[PDB]
Write a sequence for this structure.
RNA sequence: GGUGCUGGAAGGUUAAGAGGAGCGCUUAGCGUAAGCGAAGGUGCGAAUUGAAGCCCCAGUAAACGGCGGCCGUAAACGGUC
């Protein structure tokens, strides 16, 4: 439940995946569920499914 | 943003024209000496007023015109001028 930098409040959902070598940390905005940023950036070609 | 066009004087810059302070030049006369000098005439004219325009403020790009660089990351996103 993070306050935005402009003053209002918008809930953020942080996703932690622990899958060994496929582990990643991905933050979403919890309303549209688009990836704001990821700890490991993946391409549409390399790891085509679940592109970060 | 700059330049054109349109709109706006809050504030400065404002010309000619009004306005006349004051300062020189002459001398009727006061003066032992060198100077002071009223009324006129004759030049310089300071303050104060005195519009558009300029500085300024907004809009306008089928107006004039312009639409960038470096480093990463896989067009797109992040850091900086």
């Amino acid at each position: 439940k993070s306050r935005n930098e402009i003053g209002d409040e918008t809930v953020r959902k942080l996703y932690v995946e622990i899958m060994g070598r496929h582990s990643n940390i991905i933050l979403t905005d919890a309303a549209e569920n688009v990836i704001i940023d990821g700890l490991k950036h993946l391409s549409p070609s390399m790891n085509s499914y679940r592109t970060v």
Summary: Chain A is about 0% helix and 35% strand. Strands of chain A lie at 2-3, 9-10, 13-17, 24-28, 35-38. Residues 37, 41-46, 51 of chain A lie near RNA strand B (CB under 10 Å from a C1'). The two ends of chain A are 23 Å apart (CA to CA).
